[PDB]
Amino acid sequence: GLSAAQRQVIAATWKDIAGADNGAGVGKKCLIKFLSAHPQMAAVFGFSGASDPGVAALGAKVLAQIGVAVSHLGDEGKMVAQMKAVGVRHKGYGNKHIKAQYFEPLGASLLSAMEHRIGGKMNAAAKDAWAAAYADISGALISGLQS
Ligand code: HEM
């Protein structure tokens, strides 16, 4: 759960992160860079490498889903149930076992991609709030994945 101050920050910066492509560019950057830094992850996703066009398609889907979770930060219960459902779906995705450990490095790539787009708006308070928001969102997915 996020405090009211954290919720305020996430909601405000999300508008700038979504920009004019519902966050698709952020999702592309996040995954491309993730796979370039951890080559081993391509096989998990079933991608040929960082330049596989499925990287951009999937990055857009992940960011759109984060937008949905943010719209429900007012009702933690809904956010978590929704993310759990996404997590259950992951039971049938990928070519390698999807492990909880993979989520941490993905989170770093995501926060970096957000910063690359909004710059200065990703201040100390935004970095703290987004790390907590990502921990709740990824935590809920993992709970469904592991159920
Ligand atoms: C390292 C962690 C991750 C891995 C390995 C994983 C992998 C996958 C794969 C292989 C696909 C399916 C493409 C096709 O349908 O076969 C997918 C779909 C999806 N992923 Fe994940 N993903 C990860 C993290 C997450 C995160 C953190 C989110 C959201 C917060 C998420 C949201 C989605 C959604 C929305 C789609 C589209 C399909 C549907 O809605 O079920 N993914 N993921």
From Swiss-Prot:
Q: Which SUPFAM superfamilies match?
A: Globin-like
Q: What keywords sit in the KW lines?
A: Heme, Iron, Metal-binding, Oxygen transport, Transport
The molecular function GO annotations come to: heme binding; metal ion binding; oxygen binding; oxygen carrier activity
Residues annotated as binding heme b are 90
Disulfide bonding pattern of the chain: none
Alphabetical list of InterPro entries matching this protein: Globin, Globin-like_OT, Globin-like_sf, Globin/Proto, Mb-like_M
Which Pfam families does this one have?
Globin
Q: Which PANTHER family match?
A: BLR2807 PROTEIN (PTHR46458), GEO09476P1 (PTHR46458:SF1)
* Subunit note: Monomer.
Which family, according to UniProt? Belongs to the globin family.
| Additional notes on this entry | X-ray crystallographic analysis indicates that the D helix is absent, Leu-58 replaces the distal His (of myoglobin E7), His-90 binds covalently to the heme iron, the F helix has several more residues than in mammalian globins, and Pro-105 (G7) causes a bend in the G helix.
The protein's name = Globin, major monomeric component
